[PDB]
Symmetry: C4
Subunit: 334 residues, 4 copies
Amino acid sequence: MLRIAKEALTFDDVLLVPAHSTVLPNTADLRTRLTKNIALNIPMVSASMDTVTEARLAIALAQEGGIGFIHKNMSIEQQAAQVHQVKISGGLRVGAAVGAAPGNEERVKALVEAGVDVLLIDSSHGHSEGVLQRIRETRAAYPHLEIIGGNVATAEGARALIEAGVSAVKVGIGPGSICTTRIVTGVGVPQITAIADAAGVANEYGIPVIADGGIRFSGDISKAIAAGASCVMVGSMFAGTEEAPGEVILYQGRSYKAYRGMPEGIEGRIAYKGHLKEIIHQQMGGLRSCMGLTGSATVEDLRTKAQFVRISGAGMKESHVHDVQITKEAPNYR
Amino acid sequence: MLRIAKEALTFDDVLLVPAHSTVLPNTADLRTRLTKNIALNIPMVSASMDTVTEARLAIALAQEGGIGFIHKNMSIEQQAAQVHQVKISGGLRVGAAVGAAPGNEERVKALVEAGVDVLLIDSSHGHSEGVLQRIRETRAAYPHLEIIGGNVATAEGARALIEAGVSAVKVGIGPGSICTTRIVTGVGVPQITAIADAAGVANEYGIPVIADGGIRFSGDISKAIAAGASCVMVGSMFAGTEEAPGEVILYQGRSYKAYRGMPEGIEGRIAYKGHLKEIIHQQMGGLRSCMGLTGSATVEDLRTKAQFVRISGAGMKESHVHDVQITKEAPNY
Amino acid sequence: MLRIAKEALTFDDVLLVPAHSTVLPNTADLRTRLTKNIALNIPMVSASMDTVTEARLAIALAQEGGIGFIHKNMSIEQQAAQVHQVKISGGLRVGAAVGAAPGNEERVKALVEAGVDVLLIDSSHGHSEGVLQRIRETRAAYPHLEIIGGNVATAEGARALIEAGVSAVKVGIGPGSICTTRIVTGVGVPQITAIADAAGVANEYGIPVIADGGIRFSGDISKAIAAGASCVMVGSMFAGTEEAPGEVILYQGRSYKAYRGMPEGIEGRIAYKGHLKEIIHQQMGGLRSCMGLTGSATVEDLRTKAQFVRISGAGMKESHVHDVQITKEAPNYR
Amino acid sequence: MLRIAKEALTFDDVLLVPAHSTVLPNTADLRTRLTKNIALNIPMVSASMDTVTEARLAIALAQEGGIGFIHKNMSIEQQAAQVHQVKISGGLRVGAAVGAAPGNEERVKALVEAGVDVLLIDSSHGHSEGVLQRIRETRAAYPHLEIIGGNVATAEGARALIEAGVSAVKVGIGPGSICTTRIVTGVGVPQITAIADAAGVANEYGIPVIADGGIRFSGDISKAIAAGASCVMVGSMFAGTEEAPGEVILYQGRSYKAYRGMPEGIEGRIAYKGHLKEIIHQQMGGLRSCMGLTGSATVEDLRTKAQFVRISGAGMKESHVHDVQITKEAPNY
Ligand SMILES: O=c1[nH]cnc2c1ncn2[C@@H]1O[C@H](COP(=O)(O)O)[C@@H](O)[C@H]1O
Ligand SMILES: O=c1[nH]cnc2c1ncn2[C@@H]1O[C@H](COP(=O)(O)O)[C@@H](O)[C@H]1O
Ligand SMILES: O=c1[nH]cnc2c1ncn2[C@@H]1O[C@H](COP(=O)(O)O)[C@@H](O)[C@H]1O
Ligand SMILES: O=c1[nH]cnc2c1ncn2[C@@H]1O[C@H](COP(=O)(O)O)[C@@H](O)[C@H]1O
Ligand SMILES: [K+]
Ligand SMILES: [K+]
Ligand SMILES: [K+]
Ligand SMILES: [K+]
């Protein structure tokens, strides 16, 4: 007998159910929490990747209300340099990622000295004991430092991270656009199910959930939040924008930037997205519209009370633009 | 736990079932009702888009048993003129759309005295309080004016419209060919499920339900009605036609005409499909072949008696043309 | 509330379950019944279409053990000519189709005089009273003439046809390769479900079921039979073969023939299939192999006792050839 | 009523679940068992196809912790030689395939005295009486010769093989890359469901189950084991390699090697993928990253403890690379 735990759903398997509303899209409140002690003005944080977030993007993102995470594919000093560099740009908040393996001891130390607002312990498997123990050791050394652990996709995995002492649980095993983990390993959980399962446990402790990977459209943000996420960590959305690392590549007619997986990942190309400020404006414009459609005055309104309906592939095809030859693609329909 | 109401279906997810029939397709009674007090000879109405419905198409559709809704992005005086043109063009019935911004009753006032019959207030969210409020005022300000409210996609949504005072409930959240609302916001319900949910409530009041969007062929029209809609509204299906606004466009051997949605949508190319009279006969022809298959004498029967079956992805490929390479295309395909 | 009757399946939704076997493929018995009083050596009959079955194909098919149906898109005399022409080729059996509308009165008369072995009353809707009454009128005039009615896809539709006096019920509303009925009307039932539902009623009366339309591979034959069909009516399989009407068309590199729908249908092109004899050999070679895999000594063994399993689109993709670039396509994998 | 046993699933229908882990990928114990009395260092064996396994690939796979099965379309004397070559090539274990025609024990006799360890009788129908009979005779004629029987895809099918006297049950009816059996006959069961059904029976006898076909990546290997297979058999994954029979082929900028099935199949092109040693490290690497995710210390745990989740079509697209355009391809992708 096959040991099937359950059925699992991702973003294209569901739609948000429209409801009675006393909220205008321009009156929606996008304020939320990144950690238990850290609040964001917009529910967006950047991925800690060499092709996504350095000091330049982290500033532009923080100016819009989010938080950038400095990747760890550089020297400690350089990483510490960028944090302070971000910190001295109008009192901006900034996170910094580290490895879960021993050796990040003084890297964390310097970042704390560099005045990092939230530490991210990064791993492919947040439910591994080696990762759990690094959180415990890190928590004791800095009793009130905000720390984010991951990644997981299960309730106990979320539960295990919480007693380790995390301030927020990051959800996502496989849904990364440049990720092949689910293919190469055969292990993974469709992101919508991943969020809700972790949301079920994190809610007990009042600990925020970060949905990480898989977001491709602005409507995906609304679904991740409605699944239980406090905010979303994205890469393919910030890959392309001017502020992100890497130069623009003109290829076979159009502009591109490099977007690679930090083999589980790949090295790819992604459409240049101009200035970050417009991207967030476009992205948060869909959420606000969604919050208007579902009567969600706040993010907590959407995160806790919004309803779903399950759809087929035929339903998703109906959701997309269909049976017409597009002549002017919208900037948000890239 | 993830809050899933239920699984929702649309056109390609289902098929209708042939029953014992005493109805020949040509004899079938296609007559139905747009609103509480407005009948139609065919269950087809046109979308209030500036690339679909103005006077000519409205007149054409009305001179075939339907009704058109003149779009609203004009001068207030232009839309009244367009309405009037249809009215003097053979005493045809006509509708027109308005919004709900800080100031719209002026346009509403001008339209009624243009001889307009049914007022449409097409919104991207029919269940919003502002729309619900703007509907109550208009009904209070115009007690005998037939009012169409929408769009909604739930059972509870249609209830509000009806209790707000609408004469008809319009259904559709993100299924339109040009629509990106579901992609941009993540919000929406598959049309057929959306149709059935609103109808189930609206039938008890005796209020007609209108299917707005998602119709690609005449088969969809049949399914939309069988799910509970008293009539359907189309955009792409009527777009591109001669009577539809815009010159013909020549593009790489193929002929087209523009089609723009009213950022919640995009602009694209739709194929040129001759005079509107020719389209309707084919679309009603397929509908007639449906009623003949179902043994449905009138629209009401198909709407209330016809049964569906749920199909799979393979079942939808078996439905379309397969194996063979199309050498001589069919008018409706 | 939406009035959904049930879920319906077609050929690609299922697979036959392999079982214990004491049968070799070359020892499988393909003998079956077309009507209650007519037995076939192979469970195949041709479609009564102008691009499929005239006198030439009907002979070649009958020589292999099947029965051809002369289409009615010709004069009565010409149609009567072809039947006799087929009849005088070694005592071959032959069917002939007619319309359900009044006016086929003497066409049937001549065909009966022409010595047709089985009459087919053809209609898009076998469950229509006008069609039912033509069977009743036809049955009385020729009390023991073998008559086939259709098309239906439901149990009562099969039941209604039976009391009308049919000798066999033909199943299939929409699955035709050149058919667009399900698209244009929105009415139809996936063929696997269509057969079984009709099989449930026809079994009560010992009346054979003819599965009509949708067969694309030899494995589809086995599924139709296992669904409850006594035999299958095919068009796209006999379209292309040398014996079928129409000449060979060389187009953009390869050979073709015309295959059109008798608007509900379309006019198309289909790959030239050489001699019919080889096609049947290839087609009946898959059935025999199937009957070996499922321990089916007879067709009744497969038709009554064979099991199914439901599969996904992922399962069907696994069933096909995958993840390799075919360099030599098999004649039966056209 | 249509006789549907149950819904059956394969690799792309499911995914594995990450559990609490005290297993680093590099520490993971990949050791398993081919048969009742034959162990393997890795759970990989090669298909007995003339475009996959002869002496060189067998030696290579055996010198990496696996075993090869020399195909049978040779002279009886050639296959014995090929077996012997592997045997003297470092005392490696080796298998070989035979049929069941009117006369095969001669080949069977020649193979055993070539030093062969496990006899394979690969059939297109393991549950046929002739195969079941030919298995009983061989076990009677060779009581201590390890016998592999198959292929089957049901629970009741594996029971017969075990009761007939096989040392291992091989599973697979139509899932192979080159296989057209399911298309030609309509008969077959999706591999993962097929794996679980045979295993559920074979585990009670303590008999190993082998997964034969359907493996495209290392992730499939993990799923096949978790469903109950003690090891997997691959054809395309090892085909094309240097040690695999055939010259390299140059075709339109890309390099290949031939791959023919043994009309139940076809012939095609598979990509060139370097020395076999390089393939296995990547395929076992992904498997190691799986066990590390699942917290599985040994193959048995993954085989008996790991849980699955059922995914949809969208869930399978989220798994693969999406959105991004691949600029630098990964070895395992
Ligand atoms: O190599 C890696 N190991 C583990 N996770 C990765 C790696 N590279 C990218 N990711 C994940 O993929 C996400 C980005 O995917 P995207 O937002 O869908 O394009 C990141 O935020 C990480 O969670
Ligand atoms: O730009 C837009 N955004 C979202 N929905 C639209 C837009 N324009 C038209 N619609 C809807 O789509 C319907 C027409 O869709 P169609 O019949 O499938 O082409 C209209 O009647 C409106 O309800
Ligand atoms: O125009 C028609 N009206 C009704 N059924 C048709 C028509 N043309 C073809 N068919 C059906 O389609 C079948 C052939 O489809 P095929 O075997 O799948 O290619 C025929 O045997 C008929 O049952
Ligand atoms: O030509 C054939 N017809 C049917 N099955 C085959 C044929 N050749 C190989 N197989 C099966 O397919 C397996 C290999 O499939 P693969 O690992 O997916 O490429 C073999 O071990 C056999 O079980
Ligand atoms: K849409
Ligand atoms: K069809
Ligand atoms: K296959
Ligand atoms: K992925």
